[PDB]
Write a protein that binds this ligand. Sequence first.
Ligand SMILES: NCCCNCCCCCC(O)(O)C(F)(F)F
Ligand SMILES: NCCCNCCCCCC(O)(O)C(F)(F)F
Ligand SMILES: [K+]
Ligand SMILES: [K+]
Ligand code: NA
Ligand code: NA
Ligand SMILES: [Zn+2]
Ligand SMILES: [Zn+2]
Lengths: 341, 341
Amino acid sequence: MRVIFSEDHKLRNAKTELYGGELVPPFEAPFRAEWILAAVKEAGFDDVVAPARHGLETVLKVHDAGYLNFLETAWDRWKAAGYKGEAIATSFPVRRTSPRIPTDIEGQIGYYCNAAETAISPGTWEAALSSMASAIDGADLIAAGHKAAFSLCRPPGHHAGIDMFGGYCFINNAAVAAQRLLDKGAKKIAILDVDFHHGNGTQDIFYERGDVFFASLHGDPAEAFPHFLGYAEETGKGAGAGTTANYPMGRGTPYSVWGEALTDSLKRIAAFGAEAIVVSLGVDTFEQDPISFFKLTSPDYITMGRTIAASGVPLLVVMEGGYGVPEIGLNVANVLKGVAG
Amino acid sequence: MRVIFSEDHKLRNAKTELYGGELVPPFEAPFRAEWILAAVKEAGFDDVVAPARHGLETVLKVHDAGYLNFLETAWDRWKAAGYKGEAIATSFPVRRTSPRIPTDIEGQIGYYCNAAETAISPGTWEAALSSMASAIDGADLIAAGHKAAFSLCRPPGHHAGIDMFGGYCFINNAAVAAQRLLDKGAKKIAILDVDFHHGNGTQDIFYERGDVFFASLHGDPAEAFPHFLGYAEETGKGAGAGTTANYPMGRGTPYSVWGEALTDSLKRIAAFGAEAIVVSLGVDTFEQDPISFFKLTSPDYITMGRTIAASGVPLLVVMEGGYGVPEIGLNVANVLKGVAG
Ligand SMILES: NCCCNCCCCCC(O)(O)C(F)(F)F
Ligand SMILES: NCCCNCCCCCC(O)(O)C(F)(F)F
Ligand SMILES: [K+]
Ligand SMILES: [K+]
Ligand code: NA
Ligand code: NA
Ligand SMILES: [Zn+2]
Ligand SMILES: [Zn+2]
């Protein structure tokens, strides 16, 4: 398959992340892309191509325009306000707040944020657009008839909702890819989110839409980030009724249990009639992952890729999370081996 | 008038505040209380007494029990979870989230928080209870017939809502005082919030209650913290219809304009028939305040106190904000001079 990857991911090189009450170097840092790219090449996936640039036509169909305008100028406005650190939200529109949008940068950064650990830094918008472009070009390969492709997205995307950034995400790459496939002629698309964390952003985008089915396997939100979405009872509303399937799982979950949820999610997707599946691939389900509590082993990733590809419909694999250890590369490459085998 | 003050405020001595993307020493620091106490004594208000301790009977009528239980153990749980900094929320229940309460400390601190600049530190709960006690004893003096009293509360209270902390606030001292006056026999009480910031916490507590009228003068939430409440259109709901009056004002507002809103707020309170007024007094309206944009001068505080006391109804003055310079003490003492003169 083709691997789509932009060196412009490096424009997102934030100095800080709010973690454990401290400002520390971020878990989601450029070395992740370096390690993943090297490992996929080592596994024989060396058809690596930069994405063509894209404008906003596709992304405007999944994200709010005000939100995207906010991301475009957030850094400039923060710096102009005289703040000395990176741009980090403080006040949030929580229970029983006004729905009004503030006008100043501090109010707006909170309005448009779901998670304060994520700082906006110079280059973030440009990096996010390059990552979106990798997802779009991946989608275009699937629309053109390829049965597999890998979009090596960074920054990741699945915590970005209709109008909010957080969890290291700004533009929901998988959502944009799904939209691109619909725009190219698909009538029904699924997104299968196997990252350890719930894709709350993706769920938000498609919750009331019947053209996209969203399935997520993830740490129970009662005790895992993102904390406020991802319960099994959330199945969709309005036109999207019955098109969200959440599989929350608990501490220590191994493949023998996680794979049963995978099987079920694929049954759901097949019954929905997806013409293609966008896989939001995080490898933070790994037993060594520093911020996560599942216990998948490196061989399990091959099984996972094979099982998802046995759906018999085309796959776009879109990179999400997976942290800390160089094995993040091996684990992603193993999913691709399972898909390609 | 009696000044009620607890030395246990010092148990809240947090090391960090998230401001401008940095962790800096908090603005809401123990020295504020020292500066204020010294200035009130200097102005002749030297009848200073410690509050009697109180349990939870009054506060349970204005704050949610789960919220108070959370505050009682938050620090211990944060430390037990292995985090190295103070306890600072990251993920928040913002637009289109599940209403469910997480079980873990990271989920719960976000569930129960409206603003991430405020860290929970060891001693915070104990300090908050002492500050609440000062408000309760102040209220009891008014209930017993005194026409004025000053509760030198620290930490402050007016950003704490039914089930949320933030803005340096944990227990809404003014709300507890109002409830105490109702419990002692009043049928109608007003809270007049003259701190620069909107009392979003106080508004939340009484929004659907007809027994308390809430008026606030504050920086416009379109461009001032707390950003997500405080618009003039918010007038109450259900049983509380017509009992919230917000007076948002803009950059550079001087007393000649601010005092017009004060006059109107007092006219509203009089028409409501308040039997006493709890004044949420912050002096961050001062022209030198480091985080605020109003332009009151020190003499204006005497005018303010005189005008509020000309209501002819008993006042409990409850300390809120005011930062940076020892003149916060002069400014508070000047309000008391206007009340007592
Ligand atoms: N104590 C737990 C702290 C959790 N902090 C935020 C973790 C964000 C994870 C992001 C991701 O892996 O889901 C993505 F795919 F988006 F990259
Ligand atoms: N760039 C603006 C940063 C604002 N940060 C939070 C300010 C909280 C003010 C607290 C207060 O003064 O309203 C209280 F009365 F509660 F103490
Ligand atoms: K997931
Ligand atoms: K106010
Ligand atoms: Na849907
Ligand atoms: Na009310
Ligand atoms: Zn993840
Ligand atoms: Zn204030």
